[PDB]
């Protein structure tokens, strides 16, 4: 049940300076990057081409190459059209792709100065609830387009799910990898159970007294490691001289029954 995200971000500082950067995710694994400095999209996994032939890939990349240059000029040009309503600095974010189920739904969402304002839907661009009404002129201009609309429809409806089907097949063994959490303890009372190195992201961490789950356990956020594994810490508030008999228990799919138990 994997979601494929192409995340694009663009900063336009003034009329002559801008950059566009993107990264692509399949679930929580990075499949591509496209720095403003490269002419070409970079694979960050061996299987990032999916099942596309080299010729299908070059065609696709070439369309993106034309897109980046064209997008950049369009934004500059829309800024002139709306002056003095909006002005630099401008941030534009696109979040695009498809969510796969067995036997998919596509999306393309646009943010302006960090707010979601525009999506592609059906056969056209439209504003979403909360968007300022001045965006109707840009949208009418974009909807004029016909060639861009057909290409986007094809990308969303056909190219995305077909491509992701191939990616899932080619990246099977990476996507299904099991990496073991290693844990350790410390304090400041506030006791901290650290858990690091685990993949995939589903995990269970509780403080214990023997077999009794300490409901005071405050679980933190999932933090990434550089190697595409995860880090998590669970904290507990206690009285001094009460730390005897406390344990941190960790359950995770990579351990296979044998849970980790660290006694303080």
């Amino acid at each position: 049940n994997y979601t494929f995200r192409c995340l694009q971000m663009s900063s336009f500082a003034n009329r002559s300076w801008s950059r566009t950067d993107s990264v692509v995710w399949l679930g929580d694994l990075q499949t591509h990057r496209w720095s403003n400095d490269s002419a070409t999209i970079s694979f960050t996994k061996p299987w990032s081409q999916g099942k596309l032939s080299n010729q299908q890939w070059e065609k696709l990349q070439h369309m993106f190459q034309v897109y980046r240059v064209s997008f950049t000029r369009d934004i500059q040009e829309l800024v002139k059209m709306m002056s003095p309503k909006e002005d630099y600095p401008i941030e534009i974010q696109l979040s695009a792709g498809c969510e796969m189920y067995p036997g998919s739904e596509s999306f393309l969402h646009v943010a302006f100065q960090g707010k979601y304002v525009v999506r592609f839907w059906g056969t056209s661009w439209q504003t979403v609830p909360g968007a300022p009404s001045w965006l109707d002129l840009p949208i009418k201009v974009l909807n004029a387009d016909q060639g861009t609309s057909a290409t986007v429809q094809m990308l969303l409806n056909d190219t995305c799910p077909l491509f992701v089907r191939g990616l899932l097949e080619a990246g099977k063994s990476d996507l299904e990898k099991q990496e073991k959490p290693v844990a350790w303890l410390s304090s400041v009372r506030q006791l901290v159970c650290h858990v690091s190195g685990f993949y995939p992201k589903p995990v269970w961490v509780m403080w214990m007294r023997g077999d009794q789950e300490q409901q005071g356990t405050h679980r933190g956020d999932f933090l990434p490691n550089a190697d595409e594994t995860w880090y998590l810490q669970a904290t507990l508030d206690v009285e001094a001289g009460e730390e005897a008999g406390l344990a941190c228990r960790v359950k995770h799919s990579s351990l296979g029954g044998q849970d980790i138990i660290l006694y303080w």
Partner: T-cell receptor
Amino acid sequence: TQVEQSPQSLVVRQGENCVLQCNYSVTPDNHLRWFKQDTGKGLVSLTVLVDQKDKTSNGRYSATLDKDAKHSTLHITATLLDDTATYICVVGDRGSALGRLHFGAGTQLIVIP
Amino acid sequence: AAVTQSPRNKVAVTGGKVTLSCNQTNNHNNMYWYRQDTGHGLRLIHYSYGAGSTEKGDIPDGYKASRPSQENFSLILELATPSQTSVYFCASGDEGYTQYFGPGTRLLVLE
């Protein structure tokens, strides 16, 4: 110059056919238009080609567009004296008003009556 | 969709002020000014996305533009030179890609 037309000029006798070429490097190439400009006067649109491989007709004028080759030809059938004019090739780089037009310098046709 | 230009023809002196006017009743947001010189295609000087807005095209030097209303777009040569001898074409359009051209204006700048 991202839009090149050939020949520069040509002289043809009334009733003969002729062919005008347009080659371009403009990117992207949304559409290509052919204009007829009489001496002194203004720009009269003859046809606009929009597809990857396109063909249009307008009376005695017919045209082709191949976007892979970045190539268009305007064919004139059975030239009349009134075809004496400059023929201009124009490539638009967007399907909207965000587009710039890229003009060729034109091909001069003279039809001998 | 019709566009008119005025004057249609003009003799001017170097260092003089020349104003070329373009009128358009189609309620088009967008207007564009070009010049046509032999051996070149039309080249874009200035354009406008609406009243109050002017933008530099490819060859704006020697020219100011003015868009006082939706209907009128003007090309102002403050200090005319012989190199501004040319045929000038105005156009307009809405959000689509078609630009509708005026009949052109011939300017000769004498020494």
